[PDB]
């Protein structure tokens, strides 16, 4: 992270506690949806230099890390098109390229200068965090064990259990379309078992989740 | 959370310790009544941005999380009726809608501005915490294994044990009516076993819990 | 707890560490005598708002929690008799009732005002802690497995072991009378086994614990 | 402990970490010699109020705690003889009795006043810590499994092992006399086995421990 | 590390937490690629004196530690050639040799002087960290269980699994050449099994990792 | 440790965390070479008073602790010869003897005065740490399971494994002579098995460790 000592902004060492919590999250949860807000929280206040330490401390899951790296490169390339950089005049620090934001071609002090300079500050750490989020969302989709369309209530599975599996798989899609609404509720009802579906059909148009759970308790 | 640096209020990163304690509470306790004060303590001093990280780090129990989301939307809609928002004049920050308080349509800095502005501060974090409490109370009711009306003392169950189960289920109702008083004490006596009920009938009108426990010890 | 920021006293969030230590104490020790100083230490510097979070985070043992609640109400009622409260003149904060000290009818900021106001400060947090101590002492008596009068040395039980059990049960009474003195020492000797009692009778009037342990070692 | 806020000395809450470490030390080590420096370290900077919380959080070993209490009373009585206290003139805080130093008849604020007053400060916390040390030393002797005089080298026990047991039991005496010197070394040699004793006799007068260990390696 | 007290820079004790995390990393991960960023993070802000404590606390793996020591000596010798040091005039601190940067011939205070002196500061801690990184990279290669050229997809091994093993071994090379590009992708395809290779051949020139994983899912 | 409050240097309580880490190091690692830098790190910034708490908290291994005590006494005696102390004139604090540096005849405040006095400060804590290091080095030699001269490669033991054992035993000597150089490398080659020795003989004069490991891989 960053700290202020005197009238200057200087690197603050990344906590080993934070670093270890990130490493444990990956080892234990293996790209469940919670990895996305997990990274956001644990990378809060970080420079790209700090973020790369977090990512490089992951010892396994290298296919997923490579996918993340590929998404970082796409966004880095897109950045260069949206913000081409004229050659720094008079020995002044350049404007950051995509690789600079990713921390591959920039130092910690350069990153801090862009982040905390008075005129036209660029939050390169927070931009890089956004790129990694997109990569992690691809990984959640990749590691999802059961696609939403294959979530079907078992003959004797409690309705509450089926609903848990349904919304977990729906969330694992990681898209704006895969959210609770009339269209996704239609699928939920459709893929319920015959006994529960018969009960759900009697609840009218667009019943609430609470109504559905109440009505199907014990069926 | 929030911190003061100079004469400005700025985001303070949420502690990984706090975040992990919340995640563990859900995984281990699974919506027992203690989840309500647990959230209150662990979300103390938080902005809606921080609170959403807490809620989104929950990997399972998505039916319950959806119920919470539904209650948040109801309260968000109710807020818009009670406090409609005129269009911000002169490039000034708008007054917050329900979605702004929930952190879905607002940034961390907007949340902090509403919370710490001099004129007419709005504690959007604490309002959002109240909405989530209502959602968690619904979940406690949902996860309650034994309804209060089905708590009946076994033939040879110690009276103290039965009382523990009774007040645990009573509390799990999460209502103003489900509290120790003459009416709920009447049910407690009613659903005691024949041996203990005979002893309790001799203690007069409205005996104290201590009197009931003393009188029934060993029966 | 409370903190000073500028010239104002404001709420300080309760540590999750402290909260978890309290919850673990109850789960693991189950109202052994150490629960009383345990609460005192862990509730140090707390407002009634903070204390209620501690108490409400207890998920089981609800008979005991209800006993505590009953003692709180008795002391709250007693407070209202000793300190009736005239109606606040001129929009000034009222003087606290029993329910205000218990945190049921007061906010955190009201509690802090009473605690840190210049004229006639009232330590409502420390008063409430005293009420809860009385409740916890009742619970220690309730959970005590062996009454002091039933602690009798076994035929071949080492004297040191018997003494441990005796003073543990004596302490579990939680009264001023149940303390080491000539009267309770008389019971200790009385309930020793024939072999140790014969040795203890030869030590004169009011022998010390060290003398008793030395004399009975190996008997 | 104590802290300075403004120009005043005020109580600092005892850390739950410290308190728990003390409780665990007793439960796990059960009055081995290390309990004495352990208490000293963990009670560093404490008032008698804080120290009593530490001691009262011990749930078992009440014979030992009573022995400690008896030693505290002896030292408290001795204090009253060495420093009788005239009656406080003019509503000024009294000079502390033995019971005041022990924290039984004094509050935290009285303890802090004696500790940090300008004229004739009395470190009541550190005096009380000395009294408890004397009590803990008695307990180490009591819990010692093998008296020094019964530590004898086995027929085939390695000399290094025997030496470990010897100095552990010697230390457990907790006296000035029970220390490594010519007299205690004479006993060590005396209670070695015939094979090692023959080797030790050839090392001259007052051989060093290193010489003894070197000479007996493998015998 | 270093701290400022008054107008002077003084040693800050290395945290036991950090030290223990380093020791555990070596014991548990045994020179997997993550040891390199792990050292970088855990040695952040350290002087050579602090770094040597970290390295010397490693109790096993002494062949690897000797390899690190050999690389340190090479870089130390190279430093002396690039920056020969004239004899300090007038009792002034010398310019640092290679052994001074390694902390073998310099004290903590000398290291801090070079690091924080106004004119021509030399970051000896960060230079030494670079030397150790080179040593750790050699160790990663040494401990790598499967050379990249021996990573071949099994008859029925899922393509995702094979890809994980491939990029883990590729990374374990620790060279600029061993990175995802057209040349290394050619090897990945080449060493896939007949069923997956047939599918991969139909994806055109330089297919993306995502395309390869999508195309081979379930083959 | 020490802290500055106002214009005065005062004792800072030793952290229970640090103390516990030292105790665990001894219990778990039992005088492996890492105990030496371990003590150095964990005793950083300590007074002799603090160091004695660390050493006295060790409950077992008393032969080793006595060896340490014997080395402390030798160095203490040597100090008195090198720095005899004239009698303090005019009620001024004496110059420290060997026993004062060891903390046996001095208080914490005396130790701090010597450490932080303006004229002729004496770092008694750091001098004492040096004495204990010498004692711990003797203990490492004592606890070493396999003497360097008895480390011989097994018929089918991998060369890397043999090298680990060799350098671990070499280091356990704790002398300037027992370091990697031409002479100790000669022994390493000499005590390799016939198959590896034949390979090593072909590598010329003074081959590097890397060359030896590369050449012998799989033999």
Numbering used by the authors:
A (entry chain A), B (entry chain A), C (entry chain A), D (entry chain A), E (entry chain A), F (entry chain A): 1 to 219
What did the paper state?
HIV capsid has a pivotal role in regulating viral DNA synthesis and shielding viral DNA from cytosolic sensors. Previously reported X-ray structures of HIV-1(M) CA hexamers showed two distinct conformations with respect to a channel at the 6-fold symmetry axis. The beta hairpin structure (BHP) above the channel can assume ‘open’ (His12 forms a salt bridge with Asp51) or ‘closed positions’ (with a bridging water molecule between His12 and Asp51). Inside the channel, 6 positively charged arginines (R18) are hypothesized to mediate electrostatic nucleotide recruitment to fuel encapsidated DNA synthesis.
SIV from macaques (SIVmac) was unknowingly transmitted during laboratory experiments from sooty mangabeys infected with SIV sooty mangabey (SIVsmm) to rhesus macaques and is closely related to its parental SIVsmm. We solved the SIVmac hexamer structure to 2.25 Å, demonstrating conservation of the ‘open’ BHP conformation and of the hinge region, including Y50, between HIV-1(O), HIV-2 and SIVmac. This further illustrates the conformational similarity between hexamers bearing tyrosine at CA position 50 despite HIV-1(O) and SIVsmm otherwise being highly divergent. Inspection of hexamer structures from non-pandemic viruses revealed that the Arg lost from SIVcpzPtt/HIV-1(M) forms a salt bridge between helix 6 and the CypA binding loop in HIV-1(O) and HIV-2 CA helix 6 (Arg 120-Glu 98 in HIV-1(O), Arg 118-Glu 96 in HIV-2). This salt bridge is also conserved in the SIVmac hexamer (Arg 117-Glu 95), but not in the SIVcpzPtt structure.
